[PDB]
Copies of this chain bind each other. A is one copy, B any other.
């Protein structure tokens, strides 16, 4: 048998098979399996040599991943699944993996039933330093089993600290994964990991490769049987596909929600734009803002940049005094304090953005403390909505910090200064200044303080959300005005490609691509078709990306 002999003889053993089936039944957080030394060692070694010689990999980055890919449409990589002339051992490998013998074994052990022999579906990738793939579930088309076979250097151990682990996520409830994974596989040469695609449950990611090493892998799927094949059921594939395509936005936090401003605030903006800030007001603004941006010609420049670009990208936004305070407290927190790296360890005043197939980061919203570990925790928040109060948040912090005891390890100097900044941007006078720059009258606000931790945190490309309560107001612009004050004290972002960049783009469609920097302020007027995200922050980053995020509904006045 020229097929069975290309695999480890153990997999053909009935006792081993039942042993594997049981392992998979008993696995967590959802059913998955692994086999060590799957394939004939010579075969896989020759496949790896073929790949190194014949295939050229191109790095590709999106919001969701960074991967060295080989699946370019025109087959410039050297990989063509219709013509493996230069890769005969790879041909052999595909053949054995989709053989009847292997499919019967694999379908039995995973309890997946029958599998297509003809619908071969494989891709070849390498992960180098900084490469990663963010949380997803693999539920696409006729995919029934997901697999990865790993081909790192066959003569060295691939270690935990190298990263690139495969990580699996428990679920708070269907289609809502918990933020933190509960299992991680560190995979060696000739190891395969796999699982039955479970819509709503099979959430996994690839942990960033943290080290200067190349990790080659062959990824693939087994599909529902096609016409003419064993186990083929007419209608099954279509039934499956449509049944895998609302209520879920309830489980997202923080909410993309703005609170309306008081009458006092709005009439101050209206009055001004029916152009003039008093000297007392400039004095209040100069507490925080750089004099460059408060001068008459400075303001005039900003105003005209906004008319032209419908955006501002301001450098050295905050004055020297406040810039120095903030840099000192943020730097001190980064270098001398420990940072929570699991959502259960996050304490007041911080919250974890959830769910992880949409985003992950730490934020201060000014709301009552919230730590979402169960459906119950979430349902409770939804029954008892509260609104931000920064001064109370500030108060609470002082209680905790003062007993405790205000040491270099546990102080809240960063948080306190950041909240004072948030308070300044919450002030009536600041919003008057905003209206001055933009000729737009703010009618609502949401202010968030954000930390994007190295090796954890990210958002994905999304649109703004309007409130349908304000949709019928004809004065209200069909746009959300969005501010980002970046306070990232570390370097190497652009050169090391460390991620953490703020990206705005149209449905070159790129409006802004800004690596994190110190004391910049971006202002973007977003219509419905503008996408924004901040790229996943690499483990190699020397600090978190810290910023203050601001969102306003506006009318023209």
**Chain A residues with a Cβ under 8 A of chain B:** 249-250, 255, 257, 259-266, 284, 367-368, 382-393, 395-396, 399, 423, 426-429, 443, 467, 469-475
Inter-chain contacts of A399 with B (CB < 8 A): 399
The answer, among B262, B367, B393, B475, for a CB contact under 8 Å with A385, is B262
The residues of B that contact A473 with a CB separation of less than 8 Å are 469-473
Residue of B nearest to A262 (CB): B385
Known: A250-B264, A255-B263, A472-B472. A388 touches B387 (CB 8 A): yes
CA distance A470 to B473 in the complex (A): 7
- The 8 Å CB contact of A386, one of B263, B367, B391, is B391
Within the assembled complex, what's the spacing in Å between the Cα atoms of A257 and B265? 12
A390–B386 touching, CB < 8 Å? yes
Give every chain B residue within 8 A of A429 (Cβ-Cβ). Answer: 383
Q: Answer whether A428 and B383 are a contact pair too, CB < 8 Å, given A392-B396, A443-B469.
A: yes
Whole-angstrom CA separation of A429 from B368 in the bound complex? 19
Report yes or no: B389 in contact with A259, Cβ–Cβ below 8 A. Answer: no
Which residue of chain B is the closest to A266 with respect to CB atoms? B469
CB closest residue in chain B, given A366: B389
Tell me how many chains of this kind the complex includes.
Answer: 2
Q: Is the CB of A385 within 8 A of B467?
A: no
Q: Are B384 and A387 in contact (CB under 8 A)?
A: no
A393 proximity list for chain B (CB < 8 A): 392
Contact partners of A390 in chain B: CB under 8 A: 386
- Out of B385, B386, B388, name the residue touching A265 (CB < 8 Å): B385
Cα–Cα, bound, A475→B396 (Å): 40
Which chain B residues border A265 with CB–CB below 8 Å?
385
Residue pairs across A and B with Cβ atoms less than 8 A apart, 11 shown, are A257-B262, A264-B382, A284-B383, A367-B389, A368-B392, A383-B427, A389-B389, A399-B399, A443-B469, A471-B473, A472-B472
User: Which residues of chain B are near A367, meaning CB under 8 Å?
Assistant: 389
Q: A389-B368, A472-B473, A473-B472 are in contact. Are A384 and B259 (CB under 8 A)?
A: no
CB distance from A340 to the nearest CB of B (A): 22
Decide yes or no: A469 and B470 within 8 Å by CB, A263-B249, A263-B257, A382-B264 being known contacts. yes
Are B389 and A386 touching (Cβ within 8 A)? Answer: yes
Chain B proximity of A356: nearest CB distance (Å) = 20
B262 touches A259 (CB 8 A): no
Interface centre among A264, A388, A469 (most CB of B within 10 A): A469
CA distance A473 to B475 in the complex (A): 12
Contact indicator A428/B385 (Cβ below 8 Å): yes
Q: Which residues of B contact A469 (CB under 8 A)?
A: 260, 266, 443, 470, 473
A478 CB to closest chain B CB (Å) equals 14
Q: Which B residues touch A391, using CB under 8 A? A: 368, 386
Rounded to whole angstroms, the CA-CA distance of A250 and B387 in the bound complex is 22
Q: Which residues of B contact A395 (CB under 8 A)?
A: 392, 396
The 4 tightest CB contacts between A and B, nearest first, are A392-B392, A387-B387, A389-B389, A368-B391
Q: In the complex, what residues of B have CB within 8 A of residue A266's CB? A: 469
A360 to B428 Cα, complex, angstroms: 27
Q: List B contacts of A388 (CB < 8 A).
A: 387, 389
Other A-B contacts than A260-B260, A387-B387, A473-B473, 20 sampled, CB-CB below 8 A, are A259-B260, A260-B469, A264-B382, A264-B385, A368-B389, A368-B391, A368-B392, A384-B423, A384-B428, A385-B426, A385-B428, A387-B389, A389-B389, A392-B392, A392-B395, A443-B469, A471-B473, A472-B472, A472-B473, A472-B475
With A250-B264, A395-B396 as contacts: A259 and B387 at CB distance below 8 Å: yes
Report the bound CA distance from A250 to B265 in whole Å: 10
Give the residue among A384, A423, A427, A467 with the most B Cβ atoms within 10 A.
Answer: A384
> Considering the chains assembled together, what is the distance between the CA atoms of A51 and B161 in angstroms?
102
Query: Do B260 and A467 touch (CB < 8 A)?
Result: yes
| Residues of chain B within 8 A of A383, CB atoms compared | 284, 427-429
Partner of A255, one of B262, B385, B443, B474: B262
* CA distance in complex: A368, B426 (Å): 15
Question: Once bound together, how far apart are the Cα atoms of A261 and B390, in whole Å?
Answer: 19
